[PDB]
């Protein structure tokens, strides 16, 4: 296992130093103090830092197997880089980490912090891990121990101690290593990393969830930077929907659906991606931010006018829409429409039907929807009605 | 709004994704909801 | 606690209709006042 | 056999108002405001 991440996965870091006048005391344009940097690191006479250039690519170093408070459930993670491809990713998680293939995945891309654990809210994320543990499927959700996610690491630990017999929920946890709150614990002296967080002070970088069971820290060589990891969620997700298994009863493929719920530009750039890459998304009514945006704009049938979009941007998000600039509220609009452009890949989860199995009924819709729309759908009279 | 027992304003107008807070920023007023018998805003508190 | 959860879930939704649908029927009356308003600017 | 075709009738029929005439007032609800609509598109 060791020799396969040492011989496959790599690491990056800041070697041109692009010390930026912005920036606070002297460090590299990724972030990192020069005193914290690789060993022979020239210095850039360019301006302009990328991390497709201005970075080299190095073997990985923090790996194994995470432990979390004193004798709590070991977990696993592993620091990988956002080049990385899906195709080895995968085998990782399948072949060299005891993964079951999934019978689905759910890609929950909601508030990354201050989330309302609120009761509609929670039953429906206790339904949404019930449904991921009953079809034996995957949850991909962010890593930090934060908000949304935070709740869901506590429903799985709460699912995994009431059913121990039952099949095992994997959770996995993909963050950005330039985030990682306290780090120099996950790097190697087999080896049990103690992320201890009892002790961590109040810093503004993330700190990972304890209960997910994989954490898949994506590094880009920087300190500082989120959105990292999204390019590597998008990659594994479009990977994960081609892949192709006789054992599906989805026509061959493994089902993918993407859950929204709140958000902001990040969320909105999450369902736009899934959007592109035909994932049926499904998003939750009364949660405010992005998803009520989603379900206002699909709830009306007009002619998709910028102004309508705008309306209703600064109705749910008046702060933001305020903040942000004139490009940038044109990006998002641009963004809203686009996922409009596609309404046939996309349910509401209505607050008005309030009732039971709501999650399974809107997972259900949204994978019938997506099986509709293809060339299956032709003759699949057998696959539809199995499904 | 918690002096007037005015939960569900609070919930639509205080407690919002758009604004930002932390859990010991509400201690006091954890305290005085306490004192106060305001079992929905102890309930609000603990949830937020 | 994790019982409990689930207690506490099962008494909150059977705790929870007619108020939904009259809340959802003005809903719908409003919309129709004021595209029938907006529809008589219009033409005025 | 008949008889029992007969008394799972009966039961089904007992089984069996509000929701009806809700979905009624919610369909004329929705055909008024498409009329509307369309007569404005049609002034406009």
């Known amino acids: ?387 | 709004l918690l002096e007037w027992n005015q939960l569900d304003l609070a919930n639509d107008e205080i407690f919002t994704n758009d604004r930002r807070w932390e859990s010991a920023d509400l201690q006091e007023v954890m305290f005085t909801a306490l004192i106060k018998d305001r079992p929905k805003f102890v309930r609000l508190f603990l949830e937020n | 606690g994790v019982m409990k959860e689930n207690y506490l879930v099962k008494i909150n939704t059977k705790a929870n209709e007619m108020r939904h649908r009259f809340r959802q029927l003005d809903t719908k009356l409003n919309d129709l006042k004021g595209l029938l308003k907006e529809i008589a600017n219009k033409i005025k």
């Open chain 1, 1 to 387: 296992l060791v020799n396969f991440i040492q011989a496959n996965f790599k690491k990056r870091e800041c070697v041109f130093f692009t010390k930026d006048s912005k920036a606070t005391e002297n460090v590299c344009k990724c972030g990192y103090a020069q005193s914290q940097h690789m060993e022979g690191t020239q210095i850039n006479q360019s301006e302009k830092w990328n991390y497709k250039k201005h970075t080299k690519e190095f073997p990985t170093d923090a790996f194994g197997d995470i432990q979390f408070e004193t004798l709590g459930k070991k977990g696993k993670y592993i620091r990988l880089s956002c080049d990385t491809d899906a195709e080895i990713l995968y085998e990782l998680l399948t072949q060299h980490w005891h993964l079951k293939t999934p019978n689905l995945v759910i890609s929950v891309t909601g508030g990354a912090k201050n989330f309302a654990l609120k009761p509609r809210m929670r039953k429906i994320f206790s339904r949404l891990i019930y449904i991921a543990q009953s079809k034996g499927a995957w949850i991909l959700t962010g890593g930090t121990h934060y908000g949304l996610m935070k709740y869901i690491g506590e429903v799985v630990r709460d699912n995994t101690i009431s059913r121990s017999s039952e099949e095992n929920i994997v959770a996995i946890g993909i963050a950005a290593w330039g985030m990682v709150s306290n780090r120099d614990t996950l790097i190697r002296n087999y080896f049990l990393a103690q992320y201890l967080m009892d002790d961590f002070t109040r810093d503004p970088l993330y700190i990972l969830d304890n209960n997910h069971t994989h954490l898949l820290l994506v590094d880009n060589g920087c300190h500082g930077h989120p959105t990292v990891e999204a390019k590597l969620r998008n990659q594994l997700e479009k990977y994960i929907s081609e892949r192709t298994i006789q054992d599906s009863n989805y026509g061959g493929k493994i089902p993918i659906v993407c859950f929204a719920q709140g958000g902001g530009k990040e969320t909105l750039k999450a369902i736009n991606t899934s959007i592109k890459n035909k994932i049926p998304c499904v998003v939750v009514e009364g949660s405010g931010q992005i998803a009520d945006v989603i379900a206002s704009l699909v709830e009306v049938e007009d002619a998709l006018t910028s102004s309508a979009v705008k309306e209703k941007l600064v109705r749910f998000l008046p702060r933001t829409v305020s903040r942000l600039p004139e490009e940038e509220t044109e990006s998002w609009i641009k963004w809203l429409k686009e996922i409009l452009e596609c309404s046939h890949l996309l349910t509401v989860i209505k607050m008005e039907e309030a009732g039971d199995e709501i999650v399974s009924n809107a997972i259900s819709y949204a994978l019938y929807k997506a099986f509709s729309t293809s060339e299956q759908d032709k003759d699949n009279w057998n696959g539809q009605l199995k499904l």
